[PDB]
Design an enzyme around this catalytic site. Structure first.
Site, PDB file in Angstrom:
ATOM      1  N   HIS A  23      -7.290  -6.540  -1.107  1.00 30.18           N
ATOM      2  CA  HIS A  23      -6.012  -5.775  -0.508  1.00 30.18           C
ATOM      3  C   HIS A  23      -5.188  -6.100   0.617  1.00 30.18           C
ATOM      4  O   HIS A  23      -4.104  -6.044   0.803  1.00 30.18           O
ATOM      5  CB  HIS A  23      -6.520  -4.260  -0.571  1.00 30.18           C
ATOM      6  CG  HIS A  23      -5.395  -3.512  -0.141  1.00 30.18           C
ATOM      7  ND1 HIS A  23      -4.034  -3.364  -1.066  1.00 30.18           N
ATOM      8  CD2 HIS A  23      -4.948  -2.809   0.775  1.00 30.18           C
ATOM      9  CE1 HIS A  23      -3.173  -2.643  -0.389  1.00 30.18           C
ATOM     10  NE2 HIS A  23      -3.613  -2.480   0.643  1.00 30.18           N
TER      11      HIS A  23
ATOM     12  N   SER B 252       0.914  -1.184  -0.165  1.00 26.55           N
ATOM     13  CA  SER B 252       0.047   0.046  -0.132  1.00 26.55           C
ATOM     14  C   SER B 252       1.051   1.160  -0.030  1.00 26.55           C
ATOM     15  O   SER B 252       1.942   1.336  -0.980  1.00 26.55           O
ATOM     16  CB  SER B 252      -1.090   0.190   1.437  1.00 26.55           C
ATOM     17  OG  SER B 252      -1.964   1.313   1.762  1.00 26.55           O
TER      18      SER B 252
ATOM     19  N   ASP C  67      -8.378  -5.954  -5.986  1.00 23.03           N
ATOM     20  CA  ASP C  67      -7.341  -5.182  -5.092  1.00 23.03           C
ATOM     21  C   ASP C  67      -7.503  -3.684  -5.763  1.00 23.03           C
ATOM     22  O   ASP C  67      -6.848  -3.418  -7.010  1.00 23.03           O
ATOM     23  CB  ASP C  67      -6.080  -5.604  -4.558  1.00 23.03           C
ATOM     24  CG  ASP C  67      -5.282  -4.731  -3.680  1.00 23.03           C
ATOM     25  OD1 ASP C  67      -5.392  -3.377  -3.818  1.00 23.03           O
ATOM     26  OD2 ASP C  67      -4.362  -5.366  -3.105  1.00 23.03           O
TER      27      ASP C  67
END
Ligand SMILES: CCCCCCP(=O)(O)OCC
Ligand SMILES: CCCCCCP(=O)(O)OCC
Lengths: 265, 265
Positions: free
Chosen positions: B253, B140, B199
């Site tokens: 994710h 991320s 994601d």
């Protein structure tokens, strides 16, 4: 346109866322218851128814418341594978208702298966118631468915528407184409758417292819405190867531416011 | 162209885634150781240282281883517030280294613160060683731162581248513107882226405003078995985631393959 827212618305837215856451748871668815843681717141418411378916498965538831018234428806867314494948388927185708438108286818287928038954238941418741218112617521694828448813418711015519118815758714884726857316626116218804812151678824588917857316737215831115723113426108734108782218885451998603848505715781 | 883846681548782627887752745781851152659851694966380675721162815161661481050788660175993414615111812132611115371219612113611132121381341580271681280778881665934101651272370482110259350185982343857203883316492518360184799926864241822122882326783627688608586717181319585308758208868621994710882424568981 733117514105712122217021517180218330835232618361318412827361418631638705728671428812867516618761648804886724198973316890518631398926178982338903418421238981757871827241538831318581728712417881118250018632538831018714638831558814688952087978093929586609678717678842758714428705428831218612018342108180418130318212118713518621638722658815758832885726867881398975188937638803886834458806867613884847776307392709666208166409648606258817318207024409042209367308748406884617697966858613548607787834628603358708558842648607118817648822528406128826628612328507128834418403117728118863118527018044118530318704518311538706647732875542996703648841827212776418628731737216477708518412537308268816617105367509148917018955018444328912714017017023018442418412738506718411847451883361857612766218568915367708534008036209458707436108248508748714136209228707118116218311628505618311728522876414947471860054989210882736718303843115887816783418637109370119075609686718666208529507518603318103618321856214837341822151837681614390818481714141837412628313723117317003419705458708788608650128402112617121777308612116831132690319860046876116897934976681834121698953848751718404715181619561856681887817697973428951 | 486408283709487827182968186984280885786836394983490677786864481782881265675871570482883324572881871263966231615380223980480782821161514480550282380783312780746771796854661581063982781564343880061985050583561571050384771571751262944371303050313001922104941133954371882353570185460681270484040886054985292986280777160284480673781572871253874571866111948781716171611151881262857221841163884422827211864107615106763108421128871156520075170259011239033209541118881237956104815150882343750157854251781475620156752481760157230186661481571267230183681575360177120282380477120186011582140288041889060784470285691677861066874551986532991320873571883746843116781682782427831135681667571128620163491548531128420075020392040695470282392509060869050694480577881257791776887852878711984532874107851162720136174209131219730156271209430148881264041229440077070559390686781256781867882754985314996741759906994601848312881747777517843122847206482208338109401116833114763108670158680486390759782866885516885854479925678871079973586982497937884745782647486408291839580087730057951015459409085919693967863107286609578816618108639707877316967140979661895815867160885661881757299975483982868761864011827371641780
Ligand atoms: C500009 C958009 C960047 C989103 C980064 C999310 P990450 O760091 O999630 C980790 C839970
Ligand atoms: C064509 C893209 C549609 C994604 C629907 C995911 P929802 O149902 O997620 C519940 C955890």
């Amino acid at each position: 346109g733117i514105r712122a827212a217021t517180s218330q618305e835232i618361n318412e837215l827361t418631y638705y866322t728671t428812l867516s856451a618761n648804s886724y748871c198973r316890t518631v668815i398926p178982g338903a218851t418421w238981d757871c843681i827241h538831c318581d717141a728712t417881e118250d418411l018632k538831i018714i128814k638831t558814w688952s378916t087978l093929i586609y498965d678717t678842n758714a538831m428705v428831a218612r418341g018342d108180s418130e018234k318212t118713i518621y428806i638722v658815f758832r867314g885726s867881s398975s594978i188937r638803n886834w494948i458806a867613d884847l388927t776307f392709v666208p185708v166409s648606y258817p208702p318207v024409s042209g438108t367308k748406v884617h286818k697966g858613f548607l287928d787834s628603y358708g298966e558842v648607q118817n038954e648822l528406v128826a238941t628612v328507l128834d418741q418403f117728k118863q118631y118527p018044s118530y218112k318704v518311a538706v617521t647732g875542h996703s694828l648841g827212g776418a468915t628731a737216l477708l448813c518412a537308l268816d418711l617105y367509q148917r015519e018955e018444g328912l528407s714017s017023s018442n118815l418412f738506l718411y758714t847451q883361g857612q884726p766218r568915v367708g184409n534008p036209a458707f857316a436108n248508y748714v626116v136209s228707t118116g218804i218311p628505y618311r758417r728522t876414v947471n812151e860054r989210d882736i678824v718303p843115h887816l588917p783418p637109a370119a292819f075609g686718f666208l857316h529507a518603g318103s737215e618321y856214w837341i831115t822151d837681n614390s405190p818481e714141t837412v723113q628313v723117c317003t426108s419705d458708l788608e734108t650128s402112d617121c867531s777308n612116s831132i782218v690319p860046f876116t885451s897934v976681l834121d998603h698953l848751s718404y416011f715181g619561i856681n848505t887817g697973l428951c715781t």
